[PDB]
Design a protein around this motif. Structure first.
Motif, PDB file in Angstrom:
ATOM      1  N   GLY A 139       0.810  -1.196   0.000  1.00  0.00           N
ATOM      2  CA  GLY A 139       0.000   0.000   0.000  1.00  0.00           C
ATOM      3  C   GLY A 139       0.850   1.255   0.000  1.00  0.00           C
ATOM      4  N   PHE A 140       0.200   2.368   0.323  1.00  0.00           N
ATOM      5  CA  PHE A 140       0.882   3.657   0.370  1.00  0.00           C
ATOM      6  C   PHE A 140       1.850   3.667   1.544  1.00  0.00           C
ATOM      7  CE2 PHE A 140       0.460   7.806  -1.668  1.00  0.00           C
ATOM      8  CZ  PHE A 140       1.308   8.549  -0.880  1.00  0.00           C
ATOM      9  N   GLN A 141       3.129   3.895   1.267  1.00  0.00           N
ATOM     10  CA  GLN A 141       4.169   3.842   2.280  1.00  0.00           C
ATOM     11  C   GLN A 141       5.039   5.088   2.230  1.00  0.00           C
ATOM     12  OE1 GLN A 141       3.891   1.748   4.567  1.00  0.00           O
ATOM     13  NE2 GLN A 141       4.091  -0.390   3.947  1.00  0.00           N
ATOM     14  N   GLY A 142       5.524   5.495   3.397  1.00  0.00           N
ATOM     15  CA  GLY A 142       6.383   6.651   3.510  1.00  0.00           C
ATOM     16  C   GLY A 142       7.811   6.342   3.112  1.00  0.00           C
ATOM     17  N   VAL A 143       8.629   7.396   3.104  1.00  0.00           N
ATOM     18  CA  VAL A 143      10.006   7.266   2.642  1.00  0.00           C
ATOM     19  C   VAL A 143      10.807   6.351   3.554  1.00  0.00           C
ATOM     20  CG1 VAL A 143       9.990   9.469   1.449  1.00  0.00           C
ATOM     21  CG2 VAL A 143      10.605   9.368   3.865  1.00  0.00           C
ATOM     22  N   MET A 144      10.438   6.272   4.832  1.00  0.00           N
ATOM     23  CA  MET A 144      11.164   5.408   5.753  1.00  0.00           C
ATOM     24  C   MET A 144      11.064   3.947   5.348  1.00  0.00           C
ATOM     25  SD  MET A 144      12.640   7.372   7.851  1.00  0.00           S
ATOM     26  CE  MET A 144      13.134   6.259   9.162  1.00  0.00           C
ATOM     27  N   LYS A 145       9.865   3.478   5.018  1.00  0.00           N
ATOM     28  CA  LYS A 145       9.730   2.098   4.580  1.00  0.00           C
ATOM     29  C   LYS A 145       9.997   1.937   3.095  1.00  0.00           C
ATOM     30  CE  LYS A 145       6.650  -0.429   6.896  1.00  0.00           C
ATOM     31  NZ  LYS A 145       7.454  -1.463   7.590  1.00  0.00           N
ATOM     32  N   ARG A 146       9.568   2.896   2.278  1.00  0.00           N
ATOM     33  CA  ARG A 146       9.701   2.723   0.839  1.00  0.00           C
ATOM     34  C   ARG A 146      11.131   2.905   0.360  1.00  0.00           C
ATOM     35  NH1 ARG A 146       6.747   5.913  -4.177  1.00  0.00           N
ATOM     36  NH2 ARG A 146       6.824   4.141  -5.621  1.00  0.00           N
TER      37      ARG A 146
END
Ligand code: MG
Ligand code: MG
Ligand code: MG
Ligand code: MG
Ligand code: ZN
Ligand code: ZN
Lengths: 87, 99, 146, 94, 97, 160, 39, 38, 177
Positions: free
Chosen positions: A40-47
């Protein structure tokens, strides 16, 4: 699922034919392609694995945010910039 | 304010359109636009670019006649230039004088 | 001309040669070109003249033998290089990109990655400044740089 | 009637039929249709100039988008030429 | 043996000058295409011959690409327009000759 | 034997354009006479129809034909429906022949007959001048007078 | 062709003192000369 | 090689050759004399 | 012409398929004449709002010739907009990758920079070698003359002209050559 394999002309097999596991053999090397697990939609920390911001030491609402996205001279954001989205 | 300046621009653009069409027809007859215009002037035909384009579009045979006349005048000019002497001036190079 | 044969025996033999065409139009000229009225009227295409002046394997012949004046010799040399690069001499070879009017050797020029401003633009040489003085037959001179 | 075409005032159905009738009644060999000029042909916007010849002498020519309509137009042109009601005819004297 | 232009595509141009030298006369009869230069005109047992009326409905994309291929254009000519322009169009344009 | 000035045939020993020899004046003059006579007999017989002309008028050049209309941008001191002769004919032509003046054709040779049929005004024209930040703004409305002329006839006479 | 017209002595502008610009534009059909033009 | 604008012969064995569109001073006995036009 | 109104309009505004050959021609001159035809500037009824372009079919585009050292000097530049999308390829490399790209780019540059340019490029047809599709070959009219004149290599000269050209100098009998 139907997948398209590139073959030379001596490798043609009649359509309608069953394929089994023994087409490969032990001690061999293969390549496996598949759709990865959707996050799903993920932030820069995980993506993208950014370092983020420290938790304490006065930080306002930013611990998990991208920093600067570009420079001042560029009046835009470069294409291909790592930004949050579907992963 | 544009309706006022567009008058000038309309005149200029119409002349450019005439020149372009005349160049098209002249190249159709193998001639070039400067050659056509200059040699018509030398032949003393004072048709303006508007009617030259009108003839190129609507009166193709007359325009071919004009192109032939201009080409002949150009050839006569070349002949006179190469001769450099006092040979007869040339049939279509003759200038009708007014007093 | 003269040839050397190897068989060990090495020997020199004389073969038939051409002489000068009977009546030059300008017998008073001091150089083969000056004698035949061609000072500014030959280009890199005139492979007939160039072949008259080249070696069998594409090299040039020295001035003291061709009789050419430095100026004409150098113009022949440049025209010969240009014709070789254009491929107009298929039989004077040593031992795919179509070119013509190639001044420099193709393998010694670097690409113009940075064209300058339109007031200090780096131009691309075409033709030869030695052939600059050729007859124009036109109202616009040759464009030696593109 | 100043500025209209003959077949704009007087409607006809088969110009080829009328043309062959006129040629027969003035003792002329039947016209042969030939493809004088052609542009395109495989595209959706072709141009066909079909000429009608009599005894290998061109009597008319006509353009069209299809060969058949070009031939019909050539027939109409031939009819106009034969009846004299042509475009470049001498204008009326008032 | 001298002609100002080739004499085989539009008309047989003949230039002339009157005796007084004051006017130019041009004679230009049309050039007719030779017959030799032309080209000749190109040329279920039991049932009805049922008329083959199939009209596959193409969705907007493939439809527009087919039209663009057919007429050698781009897709923008084929995409539609809004009510503002559709109403701004003049449906009774002036018509001369 | 090479002439003193012979150049061997090179790419640029000779000018690129083809060599052109013009007709000799005497035979060419008799040819002009024959051509002019042929055109004259065409005119006499009447082997023409639907003439057109290029006419100088009101500083303009107009390509007119019979049954035509032209719009002149001024008043012409003529009552409505009045027949006049346009005279400064730069050119007259028809199918298969055309006559060229130098620069004007003789009045014995061609007549243009026209008729004043309307005397009107143009639609209002706007002249607005504007310069910004200087409060500069002027508006004027003009209506140039106009004359509608119908070209009735173009006639030629055998005079070549 | 201004230079050529000058060389022949016919002004430079074909609208200058030639018959083309100085002859009357028109006349009455019966032949009565037109009143002179303002220019 | 050393980059130079003005090439100079430092030996009697030095020789000038134009290669790849640039002039060079090559010396087989004193390789320190190798010069490249810039 | 005494044509009917609709066929007359059709004839006047019809499109023409011109043929052009590469094969030792300058891409620039090819592009100039092709662009004139594509714009329709060769027609006397031309106008930017009249859609009077014509089809241009250019062939042997793989065998064009560049004057001078253009094969190695001329650089075509593009940018995939990702940081570092700046690519620059010499004319040789571009020709090796795509055999029609050079001529296509030249015609595109010479065309007017408005919204009709892509329509004109759609009417333009390019082919690298002698092969032409049959429908296009059946559409063609008027192979236009080539701009250059193909200077005719030495071995292509006939014996008549070889001997008609005078020999310029007398070699010594004792030179090895
Ligand atoms: Mg942390
Ligand atoms: Mg706070
Ligand atoms: Mg917090
Ligand atoms: Mg001006
Ligand atoms: Zn010399
Ligand atoms: Zn040294």
């Amino acid at each position: 699922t139907v997948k398209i394999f590139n073959i030379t002309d001596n490798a043609a097999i009649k359509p309608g034919t069953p394929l089994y596991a023994a087409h490969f053999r032990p001690g061999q090397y293969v390549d496996v392609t598949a759709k990865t697990i959707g996050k799903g939609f993920q932030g820069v920390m995980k993506r993208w694995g950014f370092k983020g911001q420290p938790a304490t030491h006065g930080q306002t609402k930013t611990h998990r945010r991208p920093g600067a996205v570009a420079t001042g001279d560029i009046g835009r954001v470069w294409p291909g910039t790592k930004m949050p989205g579907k992963m | 304010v544009k309706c006022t300046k567009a008058r000038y621009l309309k005149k200029k653009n119409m002349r450019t359109l005439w020149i372009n069409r005349i160049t098209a027809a002249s190249q159709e007859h193998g001639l070039k636009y400067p050659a056509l215009i200059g040699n018509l002037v030398k032949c003393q035909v004072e048709l303006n670019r508007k009617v030259l384009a009108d003839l190129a579009i609507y009166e193709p045979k007359t325009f071919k006649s004009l192109a032939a006349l201009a080409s002949r005048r150009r050839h006569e000019g070349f002949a006179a230039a190469l001769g450099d002497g006092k040979e007869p001036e040339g049939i279509f190079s003759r200038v009708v004088q007014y007093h | 001309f003269r040839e050397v044969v190897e068989t060990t025996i090495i020997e020199g033999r004389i073969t038939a040669t051409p002489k000068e065409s009977p009546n030059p139009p300008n017998p008073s000229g001091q150089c083969p070109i000056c004698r035949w009225n061609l000072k500014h009227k030959y280009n890199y295409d005139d492979v007939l003249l160039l072949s008259q002046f080249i070696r069998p394997h594409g090299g040039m012949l020295p001035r003291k033998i061709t009789g050419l004046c430095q100026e004409e010799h150098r113009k022949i040399e440049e025209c010969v290089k240009m014709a070789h690069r254009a491929g107009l001499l298929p039989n004077h070879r040593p031992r795919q990109l179509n070119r013509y009017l190639t001044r420099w050797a193709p393998g010694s020029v670097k690409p113009i990655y940075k064209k300058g401003p339109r007031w200090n633009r780096v131009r691309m040489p075409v033709g030869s400044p030695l052939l600059r003085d050729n007859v124009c037959y036109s109202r616009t001179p040759w464009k030696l740089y593109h | 009637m100043t500025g209209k075409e003959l077949f704009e005032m007087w409607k006809i159905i088969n110009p080829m039929g009328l043309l062959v009738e006129e040629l027969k009644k003035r003792n002329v060999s039947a016209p042969e249709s030939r493809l004088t000029r052609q542009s395109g042909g495989t595209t959706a916007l072709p141009l066909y100039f079909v000429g009608l010849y009599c005894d290998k002498k061109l009597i008319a020519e006509g353009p069209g988008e299809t060969v058949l309509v070009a031939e019909e137009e050539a027939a109409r042109v031939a009819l106009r030429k034969l009846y004299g009601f042509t475009e470049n005819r001498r204008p009326w004297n008032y | 043996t001298y002609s100002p232009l080739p004499d085989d595509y539009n008309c047989n141009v003949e230039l002339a000058l009157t005796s007084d030298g004051r006017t130019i006369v041009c004679y230009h009869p049309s050039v007719d295409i030779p017959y030799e230069h032309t080209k000749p005109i190109p040329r279920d047992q039991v049932l009805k011959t049922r008329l083959e009326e199939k009209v596959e409905h193409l969705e907007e994309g493939p439809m527009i690409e087919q039209l663009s291929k057919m007429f050698f254009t781009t897709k923008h000519r084929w995409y539609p327009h809004g009510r503002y322009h559709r109403c701004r169009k003049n449906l009774n344009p002036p018509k001369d000759r | 034997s090479y002439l003193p000035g012979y150049v061997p045939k090179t790419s640029l020993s000779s000018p690129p354009w083809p060599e052109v020899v013009l007709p000799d004046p005497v035979e060419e003059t008799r040819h002009h006479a024959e051509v002019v006579k042929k055109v004259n007999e065409m005119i006499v017989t009447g082997q023409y129809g639907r003439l057109f002309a290029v006419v100088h008028f009101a500083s303009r050049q107009w390509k007119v034909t019979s049954e035509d209309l032209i719009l002149i941008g001024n008043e012409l001191d003529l009552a409505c429906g009045e027949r006049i002769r346009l005279e400064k004919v730069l050119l007259v032509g028809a199918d298969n022949f055309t006559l060229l003046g130098k620069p004007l054709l003789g009045k014995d040779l061609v007549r243009v007959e026209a008729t004043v049929i309307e005397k009107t005004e143009s639609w209002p024209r706007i002249i607005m001048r504007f310069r910004k930040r200087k409060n500069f703004k002027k508006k004027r409305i003009v209506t140039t007078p106009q004359t509608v002329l119908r070209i009735n006839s173009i006639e030629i006479a055998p005079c070549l | 062709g201004g230079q050529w017209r000058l060389q022949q002595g016919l002004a430079a502008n074909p609208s200058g003192y030639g018959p083309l610009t100085e002859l009357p534009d028109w006349s009455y059909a019966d032949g009565r000369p037109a009143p002179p033009m303002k220019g | 090689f050393k980059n130079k604008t003005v090439l100079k012969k430092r030996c009697k064995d030095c020789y000038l050759v134009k290669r790849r569109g640039r002039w060079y001073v090559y010396c087989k006995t004193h390789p320190r004399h190798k010069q490249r036009q810039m | 012409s005494s044509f009917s109104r609709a066929p007359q309009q059709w004839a006047t505004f019809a499109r023409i398929w011109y043929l052009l050959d590469g094969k030792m021609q300058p891409p620039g001159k090819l592009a100039a004449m092709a662009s004139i035809r594509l714009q329709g500037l060769h027609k006397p009824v031309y106008h930017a709002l009249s859609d009077c372009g014509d089809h241009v079919v250019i062939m042997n585009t793989r065998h064009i010739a560049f004057s001078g050292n253009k094969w190695e000097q001329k650089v075509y530049s593009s940018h995939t907009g990702y940081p570092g999308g700046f690519r620059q390829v010499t004319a040789a490399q571009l020709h090796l990758r795509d055999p029609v790209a050079i001529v296509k780019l030249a015609i595109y540059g010479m065309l007017p920079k408005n919204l009709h340019r892509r329509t004109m490029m759609e009417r333009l047809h390019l082919f690298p070698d002698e092969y032409i599709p049959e429908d296009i070959l059946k559409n063609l009219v008027e192979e236009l003359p080539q701009p250059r004149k193909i200077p005719k290599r030495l071995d292509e000269y006939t014996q008549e002209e070889i001997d008609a050209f005078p020999r310029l100098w007398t070699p010594p009998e004792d030179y090895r050559l």
